[PDB]
Design a protein around this ligand. Structure first.
Ligand SMILES: O=C(O)C[C@H](NC(=O)c1ncnc2[nH]ccc12)c1ccc(O)cc1
Length: 167
């Protein structure tokens, strides 16, 4: 039993809710929140911009130190950093950005990072400003993640479409 509330169950291990991941993280304080990161951990907009703003830029400060030490992530890769005031940990995961020309096949690799964590609060990878089809992102999520994932979908119209078209 965990603290997530109001989610629709899609599968044994995948759940979905129309919610702002920032407000959801602040309420649940999950062990792991997933950030829709880029390889440079520059949290300028989208989910990443929103999560970083909610940390009063502490996420960005920590991220800049991480990059100065380790260099950029790989597309499809991830790193674990602090969750600051939002969660115990933040799993920064780099889904491919279609608006940069990156291979959509890397989306499965991106979701594989979730399997290293028993329970996660997460957005749909590569959706929104990363330019992929969210219906597809959801299919890959369900077919790749085996741990317990709670998806927060910001847009109500998108959420209703995701549920009504789910196979
Ligand atoms: O629809 C989606 O969920 C994908 C994408 N989502 C986010 O960027 C997002 N997801 C969850 N929590 C969040 N908090 C702040 C941003 C945010 C999106 C959003 C709006 C839109 O019109 C089209 C796609």
């Amino acid at each position: 039993v965990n603290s997530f509330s109001g989610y629709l169950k899609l599968t044994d291990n995948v759940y979905i809710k129309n919610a702002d991941i920032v407000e959801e993280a602040k309420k649940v304080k999950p062990t792991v929140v997933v950030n829709a990161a880029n390889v440079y951990l520059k949290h300028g907009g989208g989910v990443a911009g929103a999560l970083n703003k909610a940390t009063n830029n502490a996420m960005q400060v920590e991220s800049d130190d991480y990059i100065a030490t380790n260099g950029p992530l790989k597309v499809g890769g991830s790193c674990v950093l602090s969750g600051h005031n939002l969660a115990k940990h933040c799993l920064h995961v780099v889904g491919p950005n279609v608006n940069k020309g990156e291979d959509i096949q890397l989306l499965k690799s991106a979701y594989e990072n979730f399997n290293q964590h028993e329970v996660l609060l997460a957005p749909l990878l590569s959706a929104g400003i990363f330019g992929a089809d969210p219906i597809h992102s959801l299919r890959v999520c369900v077919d790749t993640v085996r741990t317990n994932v709670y998806l927060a979908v910001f847009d109500k119209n998108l959420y209703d479409k995701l549920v009504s078209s789910f196979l």
